[PDB]
């Protein structure tokens, strides 16, 4: 994807004006710097390869992290899957209105020892289980439950010390594209919830320890990294200026346009 | 010349003596649904003369200390002719629009409007924990208007009407990426857009999803000397194009 | 029993890698595509759309729509200065928050020309001439019209066509330039001066306004993607 080069020019005196246009027509002028001045013949070998939608978006970014404690009943984490709880990924996915991508999902699971009181503590390697419940399935309510069989739900099992686990998710949606924005209600009588939260029904993500509480409590932490592949993007959008406020909606407190300088002639 | 147009749709005609060239969509003209893209199994109803005509919305007065206006687009035509009587009886619906904003002044007035057509515009509530109701988001063929101050957090459910953030949280100057056209009273006199159907589903319900929003924001305000006519109105005429509907049910 | 030998780099998690991965839902069928208008294939189609740049920052106009209007009136002397700002599209707070300057804050290097479309938002009888000058660095800011007429300039005459495009060239020692503030690769200044006055007839308001746009030419390039410094977060959104 090589960019265009400037062609040579000569001093002119003619009735053709490339500089003057009419910006009222909603059409940006296509002038080249060989039309307003004299130029030479340079050839550009510059490439526009690192600004396509593929290379701009295919990079891993954290979206949530949850902690859970071993020595506890109902010590297990859960997360309703949505990508609107960080600020550095929510700003990239709200540059376009409709997206369509296949994920590549990676977890980085760590551990930390809690201040126990038993003497000569020694714990072996730990195993974690990450179950994905689709919208409508059975949910667990404690650590040793019947719902952790994964009879049809996908799940991974990971011992500590190895490489981090990684799956790949295809395009799981009802319509033809993921819609990052939605201006409309859920009920047909136009009440209830309003916004983007009526479109998000993607499931839940449950995590737990497989080992039992031996002698010392162990608190873990799991960070979740999304990575879109084969991305197509439609209908671009001006980026967000104000700070983000909530997860469910597009609320804000008003902010000035830019920062201020001291004059109009100052540099 | 390249300054006069004449648009004919149905049984109505919009002529003009000086206006700029038309801004058509993101490049594509509005057309009917294909066969390899459809998802409904029952045959659509395409009247094509009973809906595709120019409906004239209400006129708003451009003052000197005015802020802006917005019309939510498949909501403003809910009581207009046989387009508002096909929206109530049918479940789905698919339309493309042809917006035409017109505001005239003499050679001694000055000002500048920005006529943009923003798709899927969510508005932010005043108190940050709630969402705005229906009556504060859009009125039946009546313009809701911005302000030049900030709506406080004391109000429960009202739309934030700060014009310099355009209600959505973007900068107001960055709205020129959407299809837009300026009305400059020095040269221009009216600005016309043609908008295709931009949505992620091939057909959509029309009473709970407003997929376009027409915004008018004055960047350089109106100003005149003492003696000229002080009442300058703005009238918007909006026509559907290539409409079809499925799923006939009761009145709703 | 093929003998392998695992090189360094094993069992690491690099956040910009290109590998294959086992699919989690096998034999899934996707929803077929649809011709949605306005497909963007490259981010240099968003940067080539013009956007209004807020020149008039005076500490009480940024919280208004008065930040976009550069005020122009009828003078009594000649050769005054309408505005002026240095041309750093990722660090200067004039060009910081436009449509061009926000895509440029994700990247670190840039090269190419920059168009600057002006528009005269005045009356129908008022005329005037403006001199849009651009001076490459090495000296200071130009102070007079006699000093700013030496650089690249274009003399705009208002009339029926009411918008003029000054296209700044690419005059630089390096192939690219830094987005951040670096004085080794300074890029120059952009000024604008009264050529003749603004002459109006009777019963016309003498104070006219001017809008200014900014976009990139057909040879813009960016490189070395980074993260933006404008967004911020302390707690999770919930």
């Amino acid at each position, epitope marked *: 994807a090589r960019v265009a080069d400037t062609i040579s020019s000569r001093p002119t005196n003619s009735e053709s004006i490339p500089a003057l246009t009419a910006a009222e027509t909603g059409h940006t002028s296509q002038v080249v710097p060989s039309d307003t001045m004299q130029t030479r013949h340079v050839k550009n070998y510059h490439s526009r390869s690192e600004s396509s939608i593929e290379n701009f978006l295919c990079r891993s970014a954290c979206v949530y992290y949850a*902690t859970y404690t071993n020595n506890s009943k109902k010590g297990f984490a859960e997360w309703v899957i949505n990508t609107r709880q960080v600020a550095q990924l929510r700003r990239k996915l709200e540059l376009f209105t409709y997206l369509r991508f296949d994920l590549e999902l990676t977890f980085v699971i760590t551990s930390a020892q*809690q*201040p126990s009181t038993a003497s000569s503590v020694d714990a072996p390697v730990q195993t974690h289980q990450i179950m994905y419940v689709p919208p409508g399935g059975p949910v667990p309510t404690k650590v040793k439950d019947y719902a952790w069989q994964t009879s049809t739900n996908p799940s991974v099992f990971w011992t500590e010390g190895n490489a981090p686990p990684r799956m790949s998710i295809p395009f799981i949606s009802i319509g033809n594209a993921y819609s990052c924005f939605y201006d409309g209600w859920t009920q047909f009588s136009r009440n209830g919830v309003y916004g983007i939260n009526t479109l998000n029904n993607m499931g839940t993500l449950y995590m737990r320890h497989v080992n039992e509480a031996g002698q010392g409590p162990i*608190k873990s932490t799991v960070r979740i990294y999304f990575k879109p592949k084969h991305v197509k993007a439609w209908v671009p959008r001006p980026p967000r200026l104000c*700070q*983000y*406020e*909530k997860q469910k909606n597009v609320n804000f*407190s*008003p*902010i*000035g346009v830019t*920062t*201020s300088r001291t004059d109009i002639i100052t540099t | 010349s390249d300054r006069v147009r004449s648009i004919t749709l149905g049984n109505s005609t919009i002529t003009t003596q000086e206006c700029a060239n038309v801004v058509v969509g993101y490049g594509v003209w509005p057309e009917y649904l294909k066969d390899n893209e459809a998802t409904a199994e029952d045959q659509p109803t395409q009247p094509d003369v009973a809906t595709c005509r120019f409906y004239t919305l209400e006129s708003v007065q451009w003052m000197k200390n005015s802020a802006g206006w917005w019309w939510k687009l498949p909501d403003a035509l809910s009581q207009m002719g046989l387009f508002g009587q096909n929206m109530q009886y049918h479940y789905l619906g698919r339309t493309g629009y042809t917006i035409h904003v017109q505001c005239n002044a003499s050679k001694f007035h000055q000002g500048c409007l920005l006529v943009v057509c923003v798709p899927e515009a969510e508005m932010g509530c005043s*108190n*940050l*924990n709630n969402t705005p109701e229906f009556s504060e988001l859009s009125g039946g063929d009546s313009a809701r208007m911005f302000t030049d*101050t*900030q709506v*406080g*957090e*004391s109000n429960a459910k009202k739309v934030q009407t700060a014009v310099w953030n355009a209600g959505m949280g973007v900068g107001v100057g960055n709205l020129t990426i959407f299809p837009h056209q300026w009305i400059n009273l020095r040269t221009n006199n009216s600005a016309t857009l043609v908008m295709p159907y931009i949505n992620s589903v091939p057909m959509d319900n029309m009473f709970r999803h407003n997929n376009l929003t027409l915004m008018i924001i004055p960047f350089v305000p109106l100003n005149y000397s003492e003696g000229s006519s002080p009442y300058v109105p703005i009238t918007v005429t909006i026509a559907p194009m290539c409409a079809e509907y499925n799923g006939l049910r009761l009145a709703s | 029993g093929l003998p392998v030998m695992t090189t360094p780099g094993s069992t690491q998690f690099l956040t910009s890698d290109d590998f294959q991965s086992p699919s989690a839902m096998p034999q899934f069928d996707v929803t077929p595509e649809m011709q949605i208008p306005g497909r963007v294939n490259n981010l240099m189609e968003i940067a080539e759309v013009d956007s209004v740049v807020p020149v008039n920052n005076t*500490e009480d106009n*940024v*919280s208004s729509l008065k930040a976009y209007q550069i005020p122009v009136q009828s003078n009594s002397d000649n050769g005054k200065q309408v505005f002026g700002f240095p041309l750093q599209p990722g660090a200067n707070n004039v060009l910081n928050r436009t449509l061009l300057g926000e895509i440029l804050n994700y990247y670190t290097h840039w090269s190419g020309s920059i168009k600057l479309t002006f528009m005269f938002c005045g009356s129908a009888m008022a005329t005037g001439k403006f001199l849009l000058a651009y001076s490459p660095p090495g000296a200071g800011v130009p102070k007079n019209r006699k000093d700013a007429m030496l650089g690249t300039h274009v003399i705009w005459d208002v009339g029926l066509q009411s918008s003029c495009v000054l296209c700044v060239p690419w005059i630089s020692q390096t192939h690219y330039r830094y987005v951040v503030e670096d004085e080794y690769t300074a890029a120059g200044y952009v000024t604008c001066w009264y050529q003749t006055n603004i002459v109006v007839p009777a019963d016309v308001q003498s104070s006219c306004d001017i809008l200014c746009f900014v976009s990139a030419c057909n040879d813009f390039s960016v490189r070395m993607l980074k993260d933006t410094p404008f967004i*911020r*977060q*302390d*707690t*999770f*959104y*919930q």
Partner: antibody
Amino acid sequence: VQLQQSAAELARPGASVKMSCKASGYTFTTYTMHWVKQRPGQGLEWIGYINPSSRYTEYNQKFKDKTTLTADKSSSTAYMQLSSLTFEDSAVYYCARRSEADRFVYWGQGTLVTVSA
Amino acid sequence: DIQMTQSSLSASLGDRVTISCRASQDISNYLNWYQQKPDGSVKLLIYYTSTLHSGVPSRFSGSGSGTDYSLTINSLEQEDIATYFCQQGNTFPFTFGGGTKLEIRR
């Protein structure tokens, strides 16, 4: 990032007093800055906030007439001016920088304002 | 205005300490707990019903749903002798609860 208020001050009944909350370590013109009053025998009470980028203030319904919040973007301070001082307003005044939704993350250390004769 | 009802609690070192504050109507999980040191420095502890702030030791834990919520310190230390407020964020204006001071048993 830290917020540094002024010293403890003193005023007569009927005079006016002006506190300060010098924000440092971040960009002052982006976040709103609130003011919280704690009487020494009760719990915390809210007064009202100020948007430093647009100078739009909004007080509580009980302190609407007494307080007058103001700020300047240059020296990056936020002022609070009390008027018509009675013997009810002898308390400790904190300033807080309201992060994302409703969470007062960074607090000051608080000035003790007392009235006497 | 939502009335936030929470007085002077006592517990020994290294025990399970529980504080509870009750709102007027359902505030829908929007409760934050603060901690005021005896010198006068205030800091945010738990910014949801359960989610801990970054920089807080893992002794503190929260719970609750609907109207009644709680804060639980599962092992009391010497640094955690302070005053704890609860604050809602559901209805303007933001109203704080009364204090709750901790002290040693005997």
